[PDB]
Design a protein around this motif. Structure first.
Motif, PDB file in Angstrom:
ATOM      1  N   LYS B   2       0.822  -1.199   0.000  1.00  0.00           N
ATOM      2  CA  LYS B   2       0.000   0.000   0.000  1.00  0.00           C
ATOM      3  C   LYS B   2       0.860   1.255   0.000  1.00  0.00           C
ATOM      4  O   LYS B   2       1.927   1.307   0.614  1.00  0.00           O
ATOM      5  CB  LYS B   2      -0.922   0.005   1.218  1.00  0.00           C
ATOM      6  CG  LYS B   2      -2.395  -0.083   0.881  1.00  0.00           C
ATOM      7  CD  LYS B   2      -3.195  -0.591   2.063  1.00  0.00           C
ATOM      8  CE  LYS B   2      -2.894   0.203   3.316  1.00  0.00           C
ATOM      9  NZ  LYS B   2      -3.605  -0.351   4.499  1.00  0.00           N
ATOM     10  N   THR B   8      -2.810  13.155  -3.866  1.00  0.00           N
ATOM     11  CA  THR B   8      -4.006  13.982  -3.747  1.00  0.00           C
ATOM     12  C   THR B   8      -4.430  14.136  -2.294  1.00  0.00           C
ATOM     13  O   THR B   8      -4.908  15.201  -1.891  1.00  0.00           O
ATOM     14  CB  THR B   8      -5.143  13.386  -4.575  1.00  0.00           C
ATOM     15  OG1 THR B   8      -5.560  12.148  -3.991  1.00  0.00           O
ATOM     16  CG2 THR B   8      -4.683  13.136  -6.000  1.00  0.00           C
ATOM     17  N   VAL B   9      -4.254  13.086  -1.490  1.00  0.00           N
ATOM     18  CA  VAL B   9      -4.614  13.163  -0.075  1.00  0.00           C
ATOM     19  C   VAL B   9      -3.761  14.206   0.632  1.00  0.00           C
ATOM     20  O   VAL B   9      -4.270  15.058   1.371  1.00  0.00           O
ATOM     21  CB  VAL B   9      -4.476  11.783   0.591  1.00  0.00           C
ATOM     22  CG1 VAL B   9      -4.942  11.847   2.032  1.00  0.00           C
ATOM     23  CG2 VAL B   9      -5.256  10.745  -0.184  1.00  0.00           C
ATOM     24  N   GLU B  13      -5.055  17.702   2.283  1.00  0.00           N
ATOM     25  CA  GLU B  13      -4.782  17.990   3.687  1.00  0.00           C
ATOM     26  C   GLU B  13      -4.095  19.338   3.843  1.00  0.00           C
ATOM     27  O   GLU B  13      -4.514  20.173   4.656  1.00  0.00           O
ATOM     28  CB  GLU B  13      -3.923  16.882   4.296  1.00  0.00           C
ATOM     29  CG  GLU B  13      -4.623  15.549   4.463  1.00  0.00           C
ATOM     30  CD  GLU B  13      -3.679  14.457   4.926  1.00  0.00           C
ATOM     31  OE1 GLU B  13      -2.505  14.770   5.218  1.00  0.00           O
ATOM     32  OE2 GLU B  13      -4.108  13.288   4.996  1.00  0.00           O
TER      33      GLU B  13
ATOM     34  N   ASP C 107      -9.348  -2.106   1.171  1.00  0.00           N
ATOM     35  CA  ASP C 107      -8.270  -1.397   0.498  1.00  0.00           C
ATOM     36  C   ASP C 107      -8.835  -0.458  -0.552  1.00  0.00           C
ATOM     37  O   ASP C 107      -8.557   0.747  -0.539  1.00  0.00           O
ATOM     38  CB  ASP C 107      -7.296  -2.392  -0.124  1.00  0.00           C
ATOM     39  CG  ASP C 107      -6.565  -3.211   0.916  1.00  0.00           C
ATOM     40  OD1 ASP C 107      -6.747  -2.936   2.118  1.00  0.00           O
ATOM     41  OD2 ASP C 107      -5.808  -4.128   0.532  1.00  0.00           O
ATOM     42  N   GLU C 110     -10.388   2.536   1.005  1.00  0.00           N
ATOM     43  CA  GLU C 110      -9.355   3.462   1.445  1.00  0.00           C
ATOM     44  C   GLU C 110      -8.993   4.428   0.330  1.00  0.00           C
ATOM     45  O   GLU C 110      -9.128   5.648   0.479  1.00  0.00           O
ATOM     46  CB  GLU C 110      -8.128   2.683   1.914  1.00  0.00           C
ATOM     47  CG  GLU C 110      -7.024   3.551   2.466  1.00  0.00           C
ATOM     48  CD  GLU C 110      -5.828   2.745   2.920  1.00  0.00           C
ATOM     49  OE1 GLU C 110      -5.962   1.513   3.064  1.00  0.00           O
ATOM     50  OE2 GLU C 110      -4.752   3.339   3.130  1.00  0.00           O
ATOM     51  N   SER C 114     -10.524   9.116  -0.549  1.00  0.00           N
ATOM     52  CA  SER C 114     -10.036  10.468  -0.773  1.00  0.00           C
ATOM     53  C   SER C 114     -10.911  11.254  -1.739  1.00  0.00           C
ATOM     54  O   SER C 114     -10.829  12.485  -1.760  1.00  0.00           O
ATOM     55  CB  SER C 114      -8.605  10.429  -1.297  1.00  0.00           C
ATOM     56  OG  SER C 114      -8.115  11.741  -1.498  1.00  0.00           O
ATOM     57  N   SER C 144      -6.596   0.491   8.518  1.00  0.00           N
ATOM     58  CA  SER C 144      -7.211   0.902   7.261  1.00  0.00           C
ATOM     59  C   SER C 144      -8.512   1.656   7.502  1.00  0.00           C
ATOM     60  O   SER C 144      -8.779   2.670   6.849  1.00  0.00           O
ATOM     61  CB  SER C 144      -7.456  -0.310   6.370  1.00  0.00           C
ATOM     62  OG  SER C 144      -6.235  -0.855   5.915  1.00  0.00           O
ATOM     63  N   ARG C 147      -7.747   5.205   8.716  1.00  0.00           N
ATOM     64  CA  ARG C 147      -7.357   6.074   7.609  1.00  0.00           C
ATOM     65  C   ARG C 147      -8.560   6.457   6.758  1.00  0.00           C
ATOM     66  O   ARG C 147      -8.724   7.627   6.386  1.00  0.00           O
ATOM     67  CB  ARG C 147      -6.295   5.397   6.751  1.00  0.00           C
ATOM     68  CG  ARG C 147      -4.935   5.340   7.396  1.00  0.00           C
ATOM     69  CD  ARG C 147      -3.982   4.501   6.580  1.00  0.00           C
ATOM     70  NE  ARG C 147      -2.719   4.303   7.275  1.00  0.00           N
ATOM     71  CZ  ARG C 147      -1.852   3.345   6.976  1.00  0.00           C
ATOM     72  NH1 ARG C 147      -2.117   2.492   5.998  1.00  0.00           N
ATOM     73  NH2 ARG C 147      -0.723   3.233   7.662  1.00  0.00           N
ATOM     74  N   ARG C 151     -10.060  10.251   6.217  1.00  0.00           N
ATOM     75  CA  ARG C 151     -10.102  10.852   4.892  1.00  0.00           C
ATOM     76  C   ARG C 151     -11.507  11.236   4.454  1.00  0.00           C
ATOM     77  O   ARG C 151     -11.649  12.037   3.526  1.00  0.00           O
ATOM     78  CB  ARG C 151      -9.490   9.907   3.860  1.00  0.00           C
ATOM     79  CG  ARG C 151      -7.999   9.728   4.017  1.00  0.00           C
ATOM     80  CD  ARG C 151      -7.451   8.768   2.989  1.00  0.00           C
ATOM     81  NE  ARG C 151      -6.048   8.470   3.236  1.00  0.00           N
ATOM     82  CZ  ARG C 151      -5.330   7.615   2.518  1.00  0.00           C
ATOM     83  NH1 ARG C 151      -5.886   6.968   1.506  1.00  0.00           N
ATOM     84  NH2 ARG C 151      -4.057   7.405   2.817  1.00  0.00           N
TER      85      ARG C 151
END
Lengths: 399, 47, 174
Positions: B2, B8-9, B13, C107, C110, C114, C144, C147, C151
């Motif tokens: 991962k 972009t995140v 932020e 996953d 996740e 965004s 996960s 996160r 987001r």
């Protein structure tokens, strides 16, 4: 476009221009001065004054409305002038239409006090519905498709140098020379004095002469030499020697003839003496020992650009300004003027390429200030200018 | 494996933290306005 | 991005996986063709996740209603397993499959978490994720989910009603 018609008024220090926003030229150009004839009484208008002036009557005296700042300083008289304009020239109640008037670029200080005197005149006294104030160098520049420009205005009061970057006026780099049109009138007079016999309170004759033969003389005799005149002379001499010596024509020896009407008498100047008058604008150290070369127009332009480079790179502002030089003003029409202003700018800034712009039409620069305000008044949106209403005044009046 | 921190995140932020709109409207809005006045002057002269 | 019309094939392999997973609460993999279809679905899902680990691929994935609906379906099944609902009870003989499935889905979530940044009040993703967070004992899964939740709260106002009102004191205490 908008459903409106504005009155556009420009009070220069020498001329006043007035007319409606719906036509291409002003209805009237009249003097920014008046005769006070004496029970008092106030004469306005070019022919009214020239008639009265020629009468040569005691007690008649010419007073002015605009100081050398380009700002009105006699507000009781200014109202009488505005009344005169609205009554006899535009012929419309001042209460009906929006007003657009000009101010000169300043460093910022006299601004609030002026704005107040305008409120009092526009509102308390005239009852104008609403008015805009445009800044002369800014409007002239806009009227010319330019948002950023180094505006060099050579008027009666002197030279006014104004950098304008992206629609904003750089106040600390605003610079006003003291030598211009009116100065030239003084010198033409003092110099020609002995050929015409002649050599405040005597304002009337000073004025009448300035407005008649002196004005014609300036428009027909004076020229600005392209290069420092003292140098031109040494050179032309140095060359002339060789033509002479060589075998066994110096351009400065050409003669110019002016018919002086008041005595039916010819006045002849050589080309040098014709160049001499405007040289003073560039090198005023040549009249008195009390003037530094820095009061001259060349150093002055430079000073103002450099003070622009101090914002808030410099060799960028320098580059912006110098690619958008605007030359404007009645006096800037004297033959040779643009080229000398350019030569004078080019040598103080050799690294940069200058591109200058100027109205080439004789009339249009004399009144380019008014032309500028006009193109503001024809802007398509009410949001494009600050428009003071009776409100604004009310709210300022509070504490 | 991962990617723990995407581009972009991180960008979003940073943008949100710096924000915590008006500036963009003012700059872009003024440019749009100056441009309209300018296009219009290029019209009066031609008239 | 460089290879368009690649995602449609994976979707053709992935939607029958949705049907199977719905039918996964009982012994239903008796035949070898069923097992083959299930394994093809799992492989396509892993491929999609590995690609979603990149910016262009996840940008292409977000603009697809089918993939998002499938992720939501799997998350709601996981929530049904977590809260212990009597409607759909996983048959343990299949647990293995389900296990792998869940992981891949999370996953994916996740990543796309965004691009759905401001989550509204009645958002199903947020509720599913908080249920799974309160239930699971996995560690990869907990991190996960944390996160993904952090987001989904990027551009949200405090006064305006947002997803942050679906966080009871139990979850914050946890």
């Amino acid at each position: 476009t908008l459903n409106r018609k504005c009155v556009v008024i420009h009070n220069g220090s020498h001329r006043t221009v007035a007319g409606f926003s719906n036509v291409e030229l002003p209805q009237c150009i009249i003097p920014s001065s008046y005769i006070k004839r004496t029970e008092a009484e106030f004469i306005f208008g070019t022919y009214n004054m020239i008639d009265a002036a020629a009468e040569k009557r005691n007690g008649d005296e010419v007073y002015t409305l605009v100081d050398s700042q380009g700002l009105p300083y006699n507000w009781d008289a200014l109202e009488m002038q505005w009344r005169y304009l609205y009554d006899t020239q535009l012929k419309v109640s001042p209460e009906e239409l929006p007003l657009v008037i000009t101010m000169p670029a300043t460093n910022g200080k006299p601004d609030m006090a002026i704005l107040e005197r305008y409120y009092e005149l526009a509102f308390d006294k005239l009852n104008v519905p609403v008015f805009q104030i445009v800044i002369e160098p800014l409007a002239i520049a806009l009227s010319m498709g330019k948002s950023s420009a180094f505006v060099i205005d050579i008027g009666a009061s002197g030279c006014n140098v104004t950098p304008i970057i992206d629609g904003i006026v750089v106040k600390n780099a605003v610079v006003r020379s003291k030598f211009g049109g009116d100065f030239l009138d003084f010198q033409v007079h003092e110099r020609l004095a002995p050929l015409i016999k002649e050599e405040q309170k005597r304002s009337t004759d000073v004025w009448y002469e300035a407005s008649t033969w002196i004005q014609q003389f300036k428009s027909t005799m004076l020229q600005v030499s392209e290069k420092d005149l003292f140098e031109l002379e040494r050179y032309y001499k140095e060359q002339a020697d060789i033509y002479a010596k060589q075998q066994e024509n110096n351009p400065l020896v050409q003669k110019k003839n002016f018919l002086f009407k008041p005595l039916n008498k010819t006045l002849t100047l050589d080309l040098k003496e014709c160049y001499q008058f405007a040289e003073y604008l560039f090198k005023p150290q040549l009249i008195s020992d009390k003037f530094s070369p820095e009061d001259g127009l060349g150093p002055l332009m430079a000073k103002s650009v450099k003070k622009a480079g101090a914002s808030i790179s410099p060799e960028q502002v320098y580059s912006l300004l110098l690619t958008n030089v605007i030359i404007t003003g009645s006096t800037s029409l004297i033959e040779g003027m643009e080229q000398r202003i350019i030569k004078e700018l080019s040598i103080r800034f050799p690294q940069y390429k200058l591109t200058t712009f100027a109205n080439q039409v004789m009339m249009d620069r004399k009144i380019q200030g008014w032309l500028g305000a006009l193109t503001m008044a024809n802007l398509p949106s009410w949001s494009l200018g600050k428009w003071y209403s009776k409100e604004d005044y009310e709210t300022l009046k509070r504490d | 494996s991962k990617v723990i921190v995407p581009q972009t995140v991180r960008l979003a932020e940073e943008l949100e933290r710096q924000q915590l709109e008006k500036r963009k409207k003012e700059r872009n809005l003024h440019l749009q306005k100056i441009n309209s006045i300018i296009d219009f002057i290029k019209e009066r002269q031609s008239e | 991005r460089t290879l368009p019309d690649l995602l449609p094939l994976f979707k053709t392999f992935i939607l029958p996986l949705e049907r199977i997973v719905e039918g996964l609460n009982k012994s239903s993999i008796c035949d070898s063709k069923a097992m083959d279809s299930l394994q093809m679905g799992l492989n396509a899902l892993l491929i999609l996740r590995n690609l979603a680990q990149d910016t262009d691929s996840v940008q292409i994935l977000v603009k697809d209603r089918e993939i998002k609906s499938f992720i939501l379906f799997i998350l709601k099944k996981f929530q049904c397993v977590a809260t212990g609902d009597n409607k759909w009870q996983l048959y343990e003989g299949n647990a293995t499959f389900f296990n792998e499935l869940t992981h891949y889905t999370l996953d994916l979530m996740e990543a796309i978490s965004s691009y759905i940044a401001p989550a509204m009040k009645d958002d199903h993703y947020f509720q599913t994720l908080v249920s799974i967070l309160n239930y699971t004992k996995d560690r990869y899964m907990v991190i996960s989910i944390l996160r993904s939740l952090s987001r989904l709260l990027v551009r949200s106002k405090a006064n305006e009603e947002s997803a942050a009102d679906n966080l009871d004191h139990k979850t914050l205490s946890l």
